[PDB]
Amino acid sequence: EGVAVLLCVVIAAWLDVDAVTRVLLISSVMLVMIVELLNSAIEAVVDRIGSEYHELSGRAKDLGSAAVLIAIIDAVITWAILLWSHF
Amino acid sequence: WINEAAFRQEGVAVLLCVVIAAWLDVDAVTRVLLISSVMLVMIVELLNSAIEAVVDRIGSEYHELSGRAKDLGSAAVLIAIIDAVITWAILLWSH
Amino acid sequence: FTRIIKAAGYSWKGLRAAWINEAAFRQEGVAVLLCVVIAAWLDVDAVTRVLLISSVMLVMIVELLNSAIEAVVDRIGHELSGRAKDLGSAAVLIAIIDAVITWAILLWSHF
Ligand SMILES: CCCCCCC/C=C\CCCCCC(=O)OC[C@@H](O)CO
Ligand SMILES: CCCCCCC/C=C\CCCCCC(=O)OC[C@@H](O)CO
Ligand SMILES: CCCCCCC/C=C\CCCCCC(=O)OC[C@H](O)CO
Ligand SMILES: CCCCCCC/C=C\CCCCCC(=O)OC[C@H](O)CO
Ligand SMILES: CCCCCCC/C=C\CCCCCC(=O)OC[C@H](O)CO
Ligand SMILES: CCCCCCC/C=C\CCCCCC(=O)OC[C@H](O)CO
Ligand SMILES: CCCCCCC/C=C\CCCCCC(=O)OC[C@H](O)CO
Ligand SMILES: CCCCCCC/C=C\CCCCCC(=O)OC[C@H](O)CO
Ligand SMILES: CCCCCCC/C=C\CCCCCC(=O)OC[C@H](O)CO
Ligand code: NA
């Protein structure tokens, strides 16, 4: 999950884009990492309370995962738009 | 996750902004900023709701830190909304 | 609009407690505000201005979400307790490091 970031930075570097584009390409990937980290923290808290299933436990994890999904969608859109424009 | 509640209004506001941003005659960089700033609001709202779910999971008995966690989560949503408004204002002010 | 009113109120409570309770949060708040004001007065294009502002504001957003998580953990009273705080703090640090780099990249180009 950490190799994805490095690969993206390398691509952003290997690409001949201006500083602004490079910042957006990289920051969009960093945001995904941030959100995953926050989602995992919440999952850790849920599991801390106990292993017994609960409606609100699943809810918390679903909300967290949805946030990761939105961040990934935001990253894909970003890379699609800037590379379409670059080329 | 459960798009059948108050995530409706939040989510259509976001969705509508993405659609508007998709149609605007702006450069690529601007379009990305318009879309991601509203996208961030959705992300932060989702994380905020998740925290609220964990708090409610623990129980109904009130605790100072329970209210604090929820208050902190809301403040984050507020900052994200202010960031989106500022973004759209700065970028669109030319139009 | 009554929902937004109550939500605005929780928010102010959140900012207020964060501020009152830790100097580190207050000093971080000063830093962000100083960066927004500088960004607001720099001779840069609209796009660059937004990146300068949204990077340090993301820092504030992540700081608050992480603090929310700390509050939940502390509320419960713990290997996963430590793990939750660890994952949360990493998130804060990524946000901060990204803001600093973003500011260094952009200002080096415009200066
Ligand atoms: C009840 C009214 C709701 C209105 C929703 C908000 C509408 C905001 C902006 C509408 C203008 C859409 C953008 C049109 C435009 O810029 O065209 C792009 C350009 O390619 C035209 O050739
Ligand atoms: C953890 C450190 C936080 C520091 C927060 C306060 C410093 C933030 C940014 C410092 C760089 C901006 C200073 C350069 C500057 O202001 O140039 C002004 C420009 O208009 C001159 O023509
Ligand atoms: C021209 C090819 C460009 C290749 C790089 C495009 C990458 C765009 C978005 C990646 C953002 C996601 C970061 C990695 C991640 O955590 O997602 C993994 C998911 O399982 C699927 O992406
Ligand atoms: C999700 C399925 C539909 C496929 C669309 C995904 C492509 C990613 C973002 C599309 C939203 C922006 C469309 C507007 C547009 O003109 O994009 C091109 C940019 O202006 C230049 O790169
Ligand atoms: C100089 C910048 C001016 C921009 C300020 C625009 C702010 C407009 C509306 C702020 C949002 C109103 C409160 C909404 C809110 O409280 O968020 C919801 C809760 O935080 C969680 O649901
Ligand atoms: C002329 C540009 C200035 C106007 C800004 C246009 C709108 C830009 C960003 C709005 C994004 C916020 C939508 C989400 C939202 O409002 O949720 C509110 C909920 O009630 C909060 O819990
Ligand atoms: C639609 C009402 C928006 C309510 C919030 C207003 C306060 C927030 C931002 C004010 C924007 C001030 C003008 C920005 C502007 O002119 O951008 C131009 C670029 O900075 C060019 O470098
Ligand atoms: C448009 C820029 C907004 C950037 C975010 C502002 C920085 C975040 C928090 C600091 C501002 C919150 C106010 C602090 C506060 O409530 O003070 C309470 C009193 O000092 C206690 O009596
Ligand atoms: C006491 C701290 C208050 C913090 C200030 C928050 C203000 C946030 C955003 C202000 C909007 C930025 C204005 C940008 C601007 O003036 O553009 C002017 C351009 O030069 C016009 O082309
Ligand atoms: Na931001």
Side-chain angles (χ1 to χ4, degrees), chain B residues 40-77:
Chain B
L40 183 58
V41 173
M42 201 30 67
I43 292 169
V44 175
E45 279 170 339
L46 266 27
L47 291 177
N48 179 39
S49 293
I51 296 167
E52 174 160 6
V54 179
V55 172
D56 295 335
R57 168 64 181 89
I58 298 168
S60 63
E61 182 177 24
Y62 183 67
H63 191 288
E64 184 178 6
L65 299 176
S66 300
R68 182 180 292 172
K70 288 176 176 176
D71 292 338
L72 260 9
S74 294
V77 175

mmCIF file of all heavy atoms in Angstrom, chain B residues 40-77:
data_model
loop_
_atom_site.group_PDB
_atom_site.id
_atom_site.type_symbol
_atom_site.label_atom_id
_atom_site.label_comp_id
_atom_site.label_asym_id
_atom_site.label_seq_id
_atom_site.Cartn_x
_atom_site.Cartn_y
_atom_site.Cartn_z
ATOM 1 N N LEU B 40 -13.587 16.894 -0.690
ATOM 2 C CA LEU B 40 -13.011 16.831 0.648
ATOM 3 C C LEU B 40 -14.102 17.005 1.712
ATOM 4 O O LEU B 40 -14.041 16.378 2.763
ATOM 5 C CB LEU B 40 -11.905 17.884 0.818
ATOM 6 C CG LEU B 40 -11.161 17.871 2.164
ATOM 7 C CD1 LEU B 40 -10.478 16.516 2.462
ATOM 8 C CD2 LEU B 40 -10.155 19.010 2.242
ATOM 9 N N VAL B 41 -15.081 17.871 1.442
ATOM 10 C CA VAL B 41 -16.203 18.083 2.363
ATOM 11 C C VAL B 41 -16.933 16.767 2.615
ATOM 12 O O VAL B 41 -17.248 16.438 3.757
ATOM 13 C CB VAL B 41 -17.181 19.160 1.839
ATOM 14 C CG1 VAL B 41 -18.408 19.239 2.731
ATOM 15 C CG2 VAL B 41 -16.495 20.518 1.756
ATOM 16 N N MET B 42 -17.169 16.005 1.550
ATOM 17 C CA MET B 42 -17.823 14.695 1.646
ATOM 18 C C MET B 42 -16.990 13.715 2.461
ATOM 19 O O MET B 42 -17.517 12.985 3.296
ATOM 20 C CB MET B 42 -18.062 14.121 0.243
ATOM 21 C CG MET B 42 -19.132 13.037 0.104
ATOM 22 S SD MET B 42 -20.517 13.090 1.256
ATOM 23 C CE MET B 42 -21.343 14.586 0.767
ATOM 24 N N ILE B 43 -15.683 13.720 2.217
ATOM 25 C CA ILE B 43 -14.762 12.843 2.920
ATOM 26 C C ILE B 43 -14.801 13.131 4.418
ATOM 27 O O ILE B 43 -15.035 12.233 5.234
ATOM 28 C CB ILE B 43 -13.344 13.003 2.343
ATOM 29 C CG1 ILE B 43 -13.299 12.442 0.915
ATOM 30 C CG2 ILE B 43 -12.304 12.356 3.245
ATOM 31 C CD1 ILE B 43 -12.032 12.781 0.165
ATOM 32 N N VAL B 44 -14.624 14.399 4.768
ATOM 33 C CA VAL B 44 -14.603 14.813 6.165
ATOM 34 C C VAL B 44 -15.952 14.554 6.850
ATOM 35 O O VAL B 44 -15.985 14.120 8.002
ATOM 36 C CB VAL B 44 -14.176 16.279 6.279
ATOM 37 C CG1 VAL B 44 -14.278 16.763 7.722
ATOM 38 C CG2 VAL B 44 -12.751 16.419 5.781
ATOM 39 N N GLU B 45 -17.057 14.798 6.151
ATOM 40 C CA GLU B 45 -18.375 14.482 6.702
ATOM 41 C C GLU B 45 -18.515 12.982 6.994
ATOM 42 O O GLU B 45 -19.003 12.595 8.062
ATOM 43 C CB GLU B 45 -19.475 14.948 5.750
ATOM 44 C CG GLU B 45 -19.779 16.440 5.881
ATOM 45 C CD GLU B 45 -20.678 16.966 4.779
ATOM 46 O OE1 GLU B 45 -20.756 16.326 3.708
ATOM 47 O OE2 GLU B 45 -21.302 18.027 4.981
ATOM 48 N N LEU B 46 -18.053 12.149 6.063
ATOM 49 C CA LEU B 46 -18.066 10.696 6.245
ATOM 50 C C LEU B 46 -17.226 10.262 7.461
ATOM 51 O O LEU B 46 -17.651 9.405 8.239
ATOM 52 C CB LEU B 46 -17.570 9.994 4.976
ATOM 53 C CG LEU B 46 -18.614 9.537 3.948
ATOM 54 C CD1 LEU B 46 -19.863 10.382 4.021
ATOM 55 C CD2 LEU B 46 -18.039 9.552 2.530
ATOM 56 N N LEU B 47 -16.037 10.845 7.616
ATOM 57 C CA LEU B 47 -15.186 10.527 8.757
ATOM 58 C C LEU B 47 -15.807 11.025 10.056
ATOM 59 O O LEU B 47 -15.726 10.367 11.097
ATOM 60 C CB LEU B 47 -13.791 11.120 8.580
ATOM 61 C CG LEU B 47 -12.975 10.453 7.475
ATOM 62 C CD1 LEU B 47 -11.625 11.129 7.298
ATOM 63 C CD2 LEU B 47 -12.804 8.979 7.780
ATOM 64 N N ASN B 48 -16.429 12.193 9.990
ATOM 65 C CA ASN B 48 -17.099 12.756 11.150
ATOM 66 C C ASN B 48 -18.255 11.854 11.596
ATOM 67 O O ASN B 48 -18.441 11.601 12.789
ATOM 68 C CB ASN B 48 -17.624 14.153 10.835
ATOM 69 C CG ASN B 48 -18.353 14.769 12.002
ATOM 70 O OD1 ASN B 48 -17.940 14.618 13.147
ATOM 71 N ND2 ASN B 48 -19.457 15.446 11.723
ATOM 72 N N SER B 49 -19.030 11.369 10.632
ATOM 73 C CA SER B 49 -20.153 10.494 10.944
ATOM 74 C C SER B 49 -19.675 9.184 11.535
ATOM 75 O O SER B 49 -20.323 8.620 12.417
ATOM 76 C CB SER B 49 -20.995 10.231 9.700
ATOM 77 O OG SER B 49 -21.639 11.419 9.284
ATOM 78 N N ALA B 50 -18.531 8.712 11.046
ATOM 79 C CA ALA B 50 -17.940 7.479 11.541
ATOM 80 C C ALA B 50 -17.566 7.615 13.016
ATOM 81 O O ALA B 50 -17.829 6.715 13.813
ATOM 82 C CB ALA B 50 -16.717 7.100 10.708
ATOM 83 N N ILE B 51 -16.936 8.731 13.372
ATOM 84 C CA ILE B 51 -16.563 8.982 14.761
ATOM 85 C C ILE B 51 -17.808 9.048 15.647
ATOM 86 O O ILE B 51 -17.839 8.478 16.735
ATOM 87 C CB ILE B 51 -15.729 10.259 14.882
ATOM 88 C CG1 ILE B 51 -14.405 10.085 14.142
ATOM 89 C CG2 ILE B 51 -15.479 10.599 16.345
ATOM 90 C CD1 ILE B 51 -13.653 11.380 13.930
ATOM 91 N N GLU B 52 -18.835 9.737 15.162
ATOM 92 C CA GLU B 52 -20.100 9.834 15.877
ATOM 93 C C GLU B 52 -20.703 8.455 16.118
ATOM 94 O O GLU B 52 -21.287 8.196 17.178
ATOM 95 C CB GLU B 52 -21.087 10.701 15.101
ATOM 96 C CG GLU B 52 -22.471 10.737 15.716
ATOM 97 C CD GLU B 52 -23.281 11.928 15.255
ATOM 98 O OE1 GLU B 52 -22.805 12.665 14.364
ATOM 99 O OE2 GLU B 52 -24.389 12.131 15.792
ATOM 100 N N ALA B 53 -20.529 7.569 15.143
ATOM 101 C CA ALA B 53 -21.032 6.209 15.250
ATOM 102 C C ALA B 53 -20.302 5.450 16.354
ATOM 103 O O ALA B 53 -20.922 4.719 17.132
ATOM 104 C CB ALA B 53 -20.893 5.488 13.920
ATOM 105 N N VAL B 54 -18.988 5.642 16.432
ATOM 106 C CA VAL B 54 -18.190 4.996 17.470
ATOM 107 C C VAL B 54 -18.605 5.505 18.848
ATOM 108 O O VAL B 54 -18.742 4.722 19.785
ATOM 109 C CB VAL B 54 -16.681 5.216 17.248
ATOM 110 C CG1 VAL B 54 -15.897 4.552 18.353
ATOM 111 C CG2 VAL B 54 -16.259 4.643 15.920
ATOM 112 N N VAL B 55 -18.796 6.816 18.974
ATOM 113 C CA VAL B 55 -19.229 7.395 20.240
ATOM 114 C C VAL B 55 -20.567 6.805 20.686
ATOM 115 O O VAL B 55 -20.725 6.398 21.841
ATOM 116 C CB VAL B 55 -19.321 8.928 20.145
ATOM 117 C CG1 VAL B 55 -19.956 9.509 21.412
ATOM 118 C CG2 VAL B 55 -17.936 9.522 19.904
ATOM 119 N N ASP B 56 -21.520 6.730 19.762
ATOM 120 C CA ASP B 56 -22.840 6.202 20.082
ATOM 121 C C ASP B 56 -22.777 4.703 20.371
ATOM 122 O O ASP B 56 -23.584 4.180 21.132
ATOM 123 C CB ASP B 56 -23.824 6.501 18.950
ATOM 124 C CG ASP B 56 -24.072 7.990 18.776
ATOM 125 O OD1 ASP B 56 -23.889 8.735 19.765
ATOM 126 O OD2 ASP B 56 -24.457 8.419 17.666
ATOM 127 N N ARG B 57 -21.798 4.032 19.769
ATOM 128 C CA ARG B 57 -21.533 2.611 19.992
ATOM 129 C C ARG B 57 -21.189 2.313 21.446
ATOM 130 O O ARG B 57 -21.575 1.274 21.988
ATOM 131 C CB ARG B 57 -20.378 2.145 19.090
ATOM 132 C CG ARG B 57 -19.804 0.775 19.423
ATOM 133 C CD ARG B 57 -20.838 -0.298 19.222
ATOM 134 N NE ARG B 57 -20.338 -1.626 19.563
ATOM 135 C CZ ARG B 57 -20.397 -2.161 20.777
ATOM 136 N NH1 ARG B 57 -20.933 -1.479 21.781
ATOM 137 N NH2 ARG B 57 -19.928 -3.383 20.987
ATOM 138 N N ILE B 58 -20.445 3.219 22.071
ATOM 139 C CA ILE B 58 -19.995 3.019 23.442
ATOM 140 C C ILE B 58 -21.181 3.041 24.410
ATOM 141 O O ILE B 58 -21.200 2.296 25.391
ATOM 142 C CB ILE B 58 -18.932 4.070 23.813
ATOM 143 C CG1 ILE B 58 -17.710 3.912 22.901
ATOM 144 C CG2 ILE B 58 -18.549 3.970 25.289
ATOM 145 C CD1 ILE B 58 -16.721 5.058 22.978
ATOM 146 N N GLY B 59 -22.180 3.875 24.127
ATOM 147 C CA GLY B 59 -23.359 3.933 24.978
ATOM 148 C C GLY B 59 -24.104 5.255 24.933
ATOM 149 O O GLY B 59 -23.670 6.196 24.273
ATOM 150 N N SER B 60 -25.227 5.330 25.643
ATOM 151 C CA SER B 60 -26.026 6.553 25.670
ATOM 152 C C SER B 60 -25.623 7.448 26.852
ATOM 153 O O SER B 60 -25.919 8.645 26.853
ATOM 154 C CB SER B 60 -27.526 6.234 25.729
ATOM 155 O OG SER B 60 -27.872 5.548 26.918
ATOM 156 N N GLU B 61 -24.975 6.867 27.862
ATOM 157 C CA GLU B 61 -24.495 7.650 29.003
ATOM 158 C C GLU B 61 -23.531 8.737 28.547
ATOM 159 O O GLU B 61 -22.494 8.443 27.948
ATOM 160 C CB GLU B 61 -23.790 6.764 30.032
ATOM 161 C CG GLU B 61 -23.331 7.545 31.255
ATOM 162 C CD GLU B 61 -22.683 6.675 32.319
ATOM 163 O OE1 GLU B 61 -22.170 5.589 31.977
ATOM 164 O OE2 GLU B 61 -22.696 7.079 33.503
ATOM 165 N N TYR B 62 -23.860 9.988 28.852
ATOM 166 C CA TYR B 62 -23.044 11.097 28.383
ATOM 167 C C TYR B 62 -21.710 11.180 29.114
ATOM 168 O O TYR B 62 -21.590 10.829 30.287
ATOM 169 C CB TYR B 62 -23.787 12.432 28.501
ATOM 170 C CG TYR B 62 -22.972 13.574 27.940
ATOM 171 C CD1 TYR B 62 -22.707 13.646 26.575
ATOM 172 C CD2 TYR B 62 -22.460 14.573 28.763
ATOM 173 C CE1 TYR B 62 -21.958 14.678 26.043
ATOM 174 C CE2 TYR B 62 -21.706 15.615 28.237
ATOM 175 C CZ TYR B 62 -21.460 15.659 26.875
ATOM 176 O OH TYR B 62 -20.711 16.678 26.342
ATOM 177 N N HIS B 63 -20.708 11.655 28.392
ATOM 178 C CA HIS B 63 -19.374 11.851 28.921
ATOM 179 C C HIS B 63 -18.795 13.073 28.217
ATOM 180 O O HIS B 63 -19.049 13.293 27.025
ATOM 181 C CB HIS B 63 -18.512 10.613 28.678
ATOM 182 C CG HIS B 63 -17.205 10.627 29.406
ATOM 183 N ND1 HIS B 63 -16.163 11.459 29.050
ATOM 184 C CD2 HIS B 63 -16.756 9.886 30.447
ATOM 185 C CE1 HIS B 63 -15.139 11.247 29.859
ATOM 186 N NE2 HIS B 63 -15.473 10.295 30.713
ATOM 187 N N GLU B 64 -18.020 13.865 28.948
ATOM 188 C CA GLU B 64 -17.423 15.075 28.391
ATOM 189 C C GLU B 64 -16.638 14.805 27.107
ATOM 190 O O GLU B 64 -16.772 15.549 26.133
ATOM 191 C CB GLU B 64 -16.515 15.740 29.424
ATOM 192 C CG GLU B 64 -15.931 17.057 28.955
ATOM 193 C CD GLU B 64 -15.081 17.723 30.012
ATOM 194 O OE1 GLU B 64 -14.851 17.098 31.072
ATOM 195 O OE2 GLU B 64 -14.637 18.865 29.774
ATOM 196 N N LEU B 65 -15.852 13.728 27.093
ATOM 197 C CA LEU B 65 -15.023 13.410 25.933
ATOM 198 C C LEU B 65 -15.862 12.928 24.756
ATOM 199 O O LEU B 65 -15.431 13.007 23.604
ATOM 200 C CB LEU B 65 -13.968 12.359 26.280
ATOM 201 C CG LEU B 65 -12.970 12.767 27.365
ATOM 202 C CD1 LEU B 65 -12.033 11.618 27.704
ATOM 203 C CD2 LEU B 65 -12.201 14.015 26.958
ATOM 204 N N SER B 66 -17.055 12.422 25.044
ATOM 205 C CA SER B 66 -17.956 12.010 23.979
ATOM 206 C C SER B 66 -18.427 13.240 23.219
ATOM 207 O O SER B 66 -18.340 13.291 21.991
ATOM 208 C CB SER B 66 -19.140 11.229 24.538
ATOM 209 O OG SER B 66 -18.682 10.072 25.212
ATOM 210 N N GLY B 67 -18.906 14.239 23.953
ATOM 211 C CA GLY B 67 -19.291 15.495 23.337
ATOM 212 C C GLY B 67 -18.120 16.163 22.629
ATOM 213 O O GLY B 67 -18.266 16.669 21.516
ATOM 214 N N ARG B 68 -16.952 16.146 23.266
ATOM 215 C CA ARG B 68 -15.753 16.738 22.677
ATOM 216 C C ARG B 68 -15.404 16.101 21.334
ATOM 217 O O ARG B 68 -15.156 16.813 20.364
ATOM 218 C CB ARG B 68 -14.569 16.632 23.636
ATOM 219 C CG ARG B 68 -13.307 17.268 23.083
ATOM 220 C CD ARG B 68 -12.157 17.158 24.054
ATOM 221 N NE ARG B 68 -12.397 17.989 25.231
ATOM 222 C CZ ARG B 68 -11.639 17.974 26.320
ATOM 223 N NH1 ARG B 68 -10.585 17.170 26.384
ATOM 224 N NH2 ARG B 68 -11.937 18.760 27.346
ATOM 225 N N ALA B 69 -15.403 14.770 21.275
ATOM 226 C CA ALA B 69 -15.107 14.054 20.035
ATOM 227 C C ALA B 69 -16.059 14.475 18.925
ATOM 228 O O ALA B 69 -15.640 14.711 17.792
ATOM 229 C CB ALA B 69 -15.178 12.549 20.249
ATOM 230 N N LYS B 70 -17.346 14.557 19.248
ATOM 231 C CA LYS B 70 -18.339 14.989 18.267
ATOM 232 C C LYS B 70 -18.153 16.451 17.868
ATOM 233 O O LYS B 70 -18.309 16.801 16.695
ATOM 234 C CB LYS B 70 -19.755 14.783 18.806
ATOM 235 C CG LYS B 70 -20.191 13.332 18.877
ATOM 236 C CD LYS B 70 -21.561 13.225 19.517
ATOM 237 C CE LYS B 70 -22.073 11.798 19.504
ATOM 238 N NZ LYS B 70 -23.369 11.669 20.224
ATOM 239 N N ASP B 71 -17.807 17.300 18.836
ATOM 240 C CA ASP B 71 -17.599 18.726 18.570
ATOM 241 C C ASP B 71 -16.389 18.935 17.661
ATOM 242 O O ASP B 71 -16.424 19.749 16.739
ATOM 243 C CB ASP B 71 -17.420 19.507 19.876
ATOM 244 C CG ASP B 71 -18.702 19.559 20.718
ATOM 245 O OD1 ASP B 71 -19.807 19.383 20.153
ATOM 246 O OD2 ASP B 71 -18.603 19.787 21.946
ATOM 247 N N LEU B 72 -15.324 18.191 17.946
ATOM 248 C CA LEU B 72 -14.100 18.208 17.157
ATOM 249 C C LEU B 72 -14.360 17.754 15.722
ATOM 250 O O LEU B 72 -13.819 18.321 14.773
ATOM 251 C CB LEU B 72 -13.042 17.306 17.796
ATOM 252 C CG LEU B 72 -11.907 17.871 18.652
ATOM 253 C CD1 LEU B 72 -12.069 19.354 18.958
ATOM 254 C CD2 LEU B 72 -11.759 17.051 19.928
ATOM 255 N N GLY B 73 -15.178 16.717 15.573
ATOM 256 C CA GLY B 73 -15.522 16.188 14.265
ATOM 257 C C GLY B 73 -16.268 17.211 13.438
ATOM 258 O O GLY B 73 -16.013 17.352 12.239
ATOM 259 N N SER B 74 -17.196 17.925 14.077
ATOM 260 C CA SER B 74 -17.959 18.971 13.403
ATOM 261 C C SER B 74 -17.067 20.130 12.982
ATOM 262 O O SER B 74 -17.205 20.653 11.875
ATOM 263 C CB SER B 74 -19.084 19.505 14.305
ATOM 264 O OG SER B 74 -20.066 18.516 14.548
ATOM 265 N N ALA B 75 -16.152 20.520 13.866
ATOM 266 C CA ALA B 75 -15.251 21.632 13.587
ATOM 267 C C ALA B 75 -14.436 21.327 12.337
ATOM 268 O O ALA B 75 -14.174 22.209 11.528
ATOM 269 C CB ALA B 75 -14.341 21.912 14.774
ATOM 270 N N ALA B 76 -14.048 20.065 12.183
ATOM 271 C CA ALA B 76 -13.318 19.627 10.995
ATOM 272 C C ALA B 76 -14.165 19.790 9.725
ATOM 273 O O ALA B 76 -13.674 20.233 8.691
ATOM 274 C CB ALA B 76 -12.875 18.186 11.161
ATOM 275 N N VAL B 77 -15.444 19.448 9.822
ATOM 276 C CA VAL B 77 -16.360 19.597 8.708
ATOM 277 C C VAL B 77 -16.479 21.071 8.343
ATOM 278 O O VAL B 77 -16.481 21.433 7.165
ATOM 279 C CB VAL B 77 -17.743 18.988 9.033
ATOM 280 C CG1 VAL B 77 -18.732 19.260 7.899
ATOM 281 C CG2 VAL B 77 -17.616 17.493 9.298
#
